[PDB]
Amino acid sequence: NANDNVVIVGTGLAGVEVAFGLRASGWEGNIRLVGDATVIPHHLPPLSKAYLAGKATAESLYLRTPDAYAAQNIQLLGGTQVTAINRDRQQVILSDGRALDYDRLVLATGGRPRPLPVASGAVGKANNFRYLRTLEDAECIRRQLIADNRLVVIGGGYIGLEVAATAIKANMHVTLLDTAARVLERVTAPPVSAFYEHLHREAGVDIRTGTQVCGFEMSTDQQKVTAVLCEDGTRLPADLVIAGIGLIPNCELASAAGLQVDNGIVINEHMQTSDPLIMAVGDCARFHSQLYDRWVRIESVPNALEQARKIAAILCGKVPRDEAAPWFWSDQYEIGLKMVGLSEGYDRIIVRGSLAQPDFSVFYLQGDRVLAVDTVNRPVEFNQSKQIITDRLPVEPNLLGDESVPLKEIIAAAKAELSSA
Numbered sequence: 001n002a003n004d005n006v007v008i009v010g011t012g013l014a015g016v017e018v019a020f021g022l023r024a025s026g027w028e029g030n031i032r033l034v035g036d037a038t039v040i041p042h043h044l045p046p047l048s049k050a051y052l053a054g055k056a057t058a059e060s061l062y063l064r065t066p067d068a069y070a071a072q073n074i075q076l077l078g079g080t081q082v083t084a085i086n087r088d089r090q091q092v093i094l095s096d097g098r099a100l101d102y103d104r105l106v107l108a109t110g111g112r113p114r115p116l117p118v119a120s121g122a123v124g125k126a127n128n129f130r131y132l133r134t135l136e137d138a139e140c141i142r143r144q145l146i147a148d149n150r151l152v153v154i155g156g157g158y159i160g161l162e163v164a165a166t167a168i169k170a171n172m173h174v175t176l177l178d179t180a181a182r183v184l185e186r187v188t189a190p191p192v193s194a195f196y197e198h199l200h201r202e203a204g205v206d207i208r209t210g211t212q213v214c215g216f217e218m219s220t221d222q223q224k225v226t227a228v229l230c231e232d233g234t235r236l237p238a239d240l241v242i243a244g245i246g247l248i249p250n251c252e253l254a255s256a257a258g259l260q261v262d263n264g265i266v267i268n269e270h271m272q273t274s275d276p277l278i279m280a281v282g283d284c285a286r287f288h289s290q291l292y293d294r295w296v297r298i299e300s301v302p303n304a305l306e307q308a309r310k311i312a313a314i315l316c317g318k319v320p321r322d323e324a325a326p327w328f329w330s331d332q333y334e335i336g337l338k339m340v341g342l343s344e345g346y347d348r349i350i351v352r353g354s355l356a357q358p359d360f361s362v363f364y365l366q367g368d369r370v371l372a373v374d375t376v377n378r379p380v381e382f383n384q385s386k387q388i389i390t391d392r393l394p395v396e397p398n399l400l401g402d403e404s405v406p407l408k409e410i411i412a413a414a415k416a417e418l419s420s421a
């Protein structure tokens with residue numbers, strides 16, 4: 001429509017992709033991008049990878065060049081916080097009291113770092129204690145990635161691991177702490193955690209699992225952290241502390257406007273929230289996965305792209321792409337880590353290749369059904385695995401771990417079985 005105005009709250013990948021996708025699918029109306037961030041929209045993955053390593057330019061981070069917004073006639077309103085939504089009048093209220101009218105509203109609010117309780121007040125304020133989510137966070141941390149200085153990373157998720165890998169390369173003394181018994185405990189099988197723990201320790205990282213931070217010591221003059229204290233009495237001297245204990249989806253605007261919320265903004269098969277004219281997308285969206293027949297909220301680039309493209313399609317009267325298996329990647333010590341599917345609910349894993357080398361695939365199964373596959377330096381088996389998950393192919397479990405049998409042929413057999421019998 002060339003009259004309907006669309007307002008997108010959030011200028012992260014999700015919001016920006018909706019904006020440009022919209023104008024790419026034939027949208028003629030007005031598009032307004034509104035975000036509290038001041039910087040030009042940029043990619044996030046490089047922030048714990050090449051950019052954090054200081055090897056990529058700031059320019060390379062832009063999602064789209066600044067001129068692109070003008071050319072595609074997309075109004076970008078940065079440094080502006082949306083404080084409320086008025087479904088009745090169909091307007092979004094800005095912190096300055098200003099209100100923007102909308103015919104279609106898209107909430108691409110993403111999430112915010114989960115604060116560490118024992119790092120409140122002065123601790124969190126210290127210039128050498130940071131979470132990693134914004135460009136500002138990344139640059140503040142990078143400036144402090146100094147050889148021989150001591151870093152303590154709190155949190156063992158993929159980003160924590162990527163931060164540790166980057167710091168190690170910068171020759172820092174690195175210690176990583178996780179409360180769980182093994183890193184990535186919730187999304188991987190023990191032998192996979194073992195791989196990562198050994199991988200990092202081998203690189204020089206001192207990983208301490210089952211460790212809980214009880215507090216910090218700080219300098220009076222500089223108001224900087226000088227040490228991290230563990231519940232068991234261990235004192236870890238630190239020149240830098242990076243915390244990453246998860247993300248909190250930004251649903252406040254939704255829950256305040258009476259929209260359904262549950263660890264994310266609930267949306268239906270049409271990307272719509274409880275309110276027809278309001279949609280949600282990206283890290284903040286909790287949707288129903290028909291592939292796994294359950295409600296999930298995914299934090300990944302592929303997820304944002306897929307969801308953003310679906311919204312653009314629907315708002316333009318076009319047909320959305322069929323639901324694809326969820327996937328994401330991680331870069332640690334130049335190792336190609338690619339994960340497809342959701343492992344939740346697996347009752348066994350099958351390793352294809354040796355875990356003593358960064359070259360294998362791990363299949364997560366629930367019975368004979370493949371739920372997900374984590375691949376390490378195996379791009380082809382990764383692509384092939386997407387097909388197995390997305391199409392629910394009946395691949396023979398007893399051959400998945402047999403490297404003398406190409407995955408392509410295992411797949412061929414599964415497909416032939418459907419057509420023949």
Ligand SMILES: Cc1cc2nc3c(=O)[nH]c(=O)nc-3n(C[C@H](O)[C@H](O)[C@H](O)COP(=O)(O)OP(=O)(O)OC[C@H]3O[C@@H](n4cnc5c(N)ncnc54)[C@H](O)[C@@H]3O)c2cc1C
Nearest residue numbers: 010012013014035036044045082109110282283299300301
């Ligand atoms: C360091 C890092 C590394 C990552 N690496 C990978 C990776 O390797 N592979 C992968 O697949 N994914 C990775 N991710 C995750 C991926 O970047 C995100 O899932 C993806 O970019 C989608 O983000 P989003 O746009 O949904 O949310 P966000 O990027 O959080 O964007 C939401 C924006 O909206 C703003 N906003 C919220 N509320 C309001 C409001 N009321 N008014 C105005 N503005 C508001 C927020 O401040 C924010 O600026 C990484 C993320 C980080 C931080």
